Every structure is written in C-alpha cells, then in structure tokens.
Motif scaffolding. Structure first.
Motif, PDB file in Angstrom:
ATOM      1  N   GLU A  16       0.815  -1.191   0.000  1.00 43.65           N
ATOM      2  CA  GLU A  16       0.000   0.000   0.000  1.00 43.65           C
ATOM      3  C   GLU A  16       0.864   1.262   0.000  1.00 43.65           C
ATOM      4  O   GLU A  16       0.519   2.248  -0.649  1.00 43.65           O
ATOM      5  N   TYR A  17       2.006   1.228   0.692  1.00 40.71           N
ATOM      6  CA  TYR A  17       2.846   2.400   0.764  1.00 40.71           C
ATOM      7  C   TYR A  17       3.433   2.717  -0.583  1.00 40.71           C
ATOM      8  O   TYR A  17       3.413   3.878  -1.015  1.00 40.71           O
ATOM      9  N   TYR A  18       3.912   1.681  -1.284  1.00 38.39           N
ATOM     10  CA  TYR A  18       4.481   1.872  -2.620  1.00 38.39           C
ATOM     11  C   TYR A  18       3.375   2.390  -3.530  1.00 38.39           C
ATOM     12  O   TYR A  18       3.605   3.303  -4.260  1.00 38.39           O
ATOM     13  N   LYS A  19       2.167   1.824  -3.476  1.00 40.17           N
ATOM     14  CA  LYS A  19       1.077   2.309  -4.296  1.00 40.17           C
ATOM     15  C   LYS A  19       0.749   3.780  -4.046  1.00 40.17           C
ATOM     16  O   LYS A  19       0.462   4.543  -5.002  1.00 40.17           O
ATOM     17  N   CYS A  20       0.676   4.153  -2.757  1.00 38.83           N
ATOM     18  CA  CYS A  20       0.426   5.544  -2.405  1.00 38.83           C
ATOM     19  C   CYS A  20       1.508   6.430  -3.011  1.00 38.83           C
ATOM     20  O   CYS A  20       1.218   7.504  -3.536  1.00 38.83           O
ATOM     21  N   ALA A  21       2.747   6.041  -2.901  1.00 41.96           N
ATOM     22  CA  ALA A  21       3.801   6.887  -3.458  1.00 41.96           C
ATOM     23  C   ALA A  21       3.612   7.227  -4.956  1.00 41.96           C
ATOM     24  O   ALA A  21       3.807   8.359  -5.362  1.00 41.96           O
ATOM     25  N   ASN A  22       3.274   6.219  -5.755  1.00 45.28           N
ATOM     26  CA  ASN A  22       3.128   6.417  -7.189  1.00 45.28           C
ATOM     27  C   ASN A  22       1.866   7.221  -7.508  1.00 45.28           C
ATOM     28  O   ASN A  22       1.888   8.034  -8.410  1.00 45.28           O
ATOM     29  N   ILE A  23       0.793   7.005  -6.751  1.00 46.13           N
ATOM     30  CA  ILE A  23      -0.420   7.808  -6.946  1.00 46.13           C
ATOM     31  C   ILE A  23      -0.134   9.277  -6.616  1.00 46.13           C
ATOM     32  O   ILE A  23      -0.459  10.203  -7.381  1.00 46.13           O
ATOM     33  N   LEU A  24       0.512   9.497  -5.488  1.00 47.39           N
ATOM     34  CA  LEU A  24       0.793  10.875  -5.078  1.00 47.39           C
ATOM     35  C   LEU A  24       1.801  11.557  -5.986  1.00 47.39           C
ATOM     36  O   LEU A  24       1.765  12.750  -6.206  1.00 47.39           O
ATOM     37  N   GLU A  25       2.791  10.799  -6.446  1.00 43.47           N
ATOM     38  CA  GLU A  25       3.708  11.321  -7.444  1.00 43.47           C
ATOM     39  C   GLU A  25       3.022  11.731  -8.743  1.00 43.47           C
ATOM     40  O   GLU A  25       3.300  12.798  -9.250  1.00 43.47           O
ATOM     41  N   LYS A  26       2.090  10.945  -9.277  1.00 41.30           N
ATOM     42  CA  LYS A  26       1.357  11.421 -10.414  1.00 41.30           C
ATOM     43  C   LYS A  26       0.681  12.732 -10.100  1.00 41.30           C
ATOM     44  O   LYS A  26       0.654  13.629 -10.937  1.00 41.30           O
ATOM     45  N   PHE A  27      -0.002  12.782  -8.944  1.00 40.65           N
ATOM     46  CA  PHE A  27      -0.715  13.998  -8.571  1.00 40.65           C
ATOM     47  C   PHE A  27       0.238  15.189  -8.514  1.00 40.65           C
ATOM     48  O   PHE A  27      -0.017  16.251  -9.068  1.00 40.65           O
TER      49      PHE A  27
END
Ligand code: 78Y
Lengths: 108, 108
Positions: free
Chosen positions: A86-97
């Motif tokens: 979940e942490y890795y997923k959050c990072a990539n979502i937030l990076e796109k944002f």
C-alpha cells in the motif's frame, strides 16, 4: 516576482499534496515503532512536515530543491517497501498527482 | 572480488534494457519529437548513455548508477501525462529496477 511568487506557488503545491488522500504515509517522519530498522536502511529521511518547515524557513530558493525533497520522499518509500505494498502504491499515486500540479503551475 | 560491481551493474542494466517496457528509454529523446523537452528536463538520461558510461568505467559506485537510472524514470514522469504509455512504462520498469537492485543486495 522571482522570490515570493515561488514561495506562494510551492506552498500551494505542497498544501495540495498534503491534503491528498494518498499522502497519509508521508505526513511526518517515519516512526521507529512502525518501521524498526528504517533509520538503519534509509540514510536521507524526508517527509511532508519537514518539507513544510523547510518551506517556512525559506529553504526552497529553487524548483529543483523542492523537487529533490519531494522526490526523496518517494524514493525512500520505494527503496524501503515492496512494490505491491500500500505504501508503494500511495507513493506512485501521489507522485502522479504532484507532477500534474507542477505542470498546472508552469513551474520551470 | 575486483570487478564485482561492474559485473553486477552490467547484469542489472542488461536486464533493464531487455525488459519489454524499456523501449521509450533506449536512446536520447529527440527535440523534433518532444517540444520544449530540453527546456523542462535539465539532466536528460537514457539507457544507451548509461551503457556507455558503464563501459567507460564511470560507475565507480552503486550510488552513481542508481542516480542515473532513477533520473530516466523521473524525467519521463515529469514530462509525460500520467496515463500516457510512457508514464506507464516508466513505473513498470522502475518497479522492475527496484526489485533487481534489492535482489542484488545493492541496497538494504
Ligand atoms: C517524450 C518521449 N518521447 N520518447 C520517444 C521514445 C521512443 C520513440 C519516440 C519517442 N520517449 C520519451 C520519454 N521517455 O519521455
């Protein structure tokens, strides 16, 4: 114009990143409780509270300093955690944002 | 013992270049194909340049290698739209890259 326009734009971007629903892992320095041995592995810790303080303290005199701090938050996360966490997923979502906000602001 | 780093790096780079999602990154971005790329991206990197650097014995540490290859992904993510094929490739290949680096004990 040069100096305080930058401050306003960075503050707005950073505040928007912080309010995002995927920012929650990154809001404050990682706690040893929640990641014993984190600080053995990650040599340059970074988080969004530290960035808020750095910003307030006028550290971010250029786009590239701000980008390096925020990018470090993401590379720490991807170095420490498995890709399907979940942490890795959050990072990539937030990076796109984040990148959409940088583009939206014409930051260069 | 002596050329251990070189061998590990070469293997990692070879696997990254063979991956099905490496094709956007194989050579320098051309100005003709990417308007204002070099205005926005100040440290361009690509896997042909990395291959040269490696052959040239530039990668005397793991950190120099990791910085170059991370730059390939972050340039892509900054410049391209988040649902673009290029952005998708970058994150796929970046996940692959972090797994290979962990697999080889070059961090943790
Ligand atoms: C833009 C862009 N264009 N290209 C590209 C790659 C292959 C053929 C044609 C164009 N890559 C990128 C990139 N990695 O940001």
């Amino acid at each position: 114009r040069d100096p305080d326009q930058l401050y306003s734009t960075l503050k707005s971007i950073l505040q928007q990143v912080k309010s995002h629903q995927s920012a929650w892992p990154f809001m404050e320095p990682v706690k040893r409780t929640e990641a014993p041995g984190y600080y053995e592995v990650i040599r340059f810790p970074m988080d969004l509270k530290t960035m808020s303080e750095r910003l307030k303290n006028r550290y971010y005199v250029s786009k590239k300093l701000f980008m390096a701090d925020l990018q470090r938050v993401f590379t720490n996360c991807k170095e420490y955690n498995p890709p399907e966490s979940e942490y890795y997923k959050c990072a990539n979502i937030l990076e796109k944002f984040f990148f959409s906000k940088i583009k939206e602001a014409g930051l260069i």
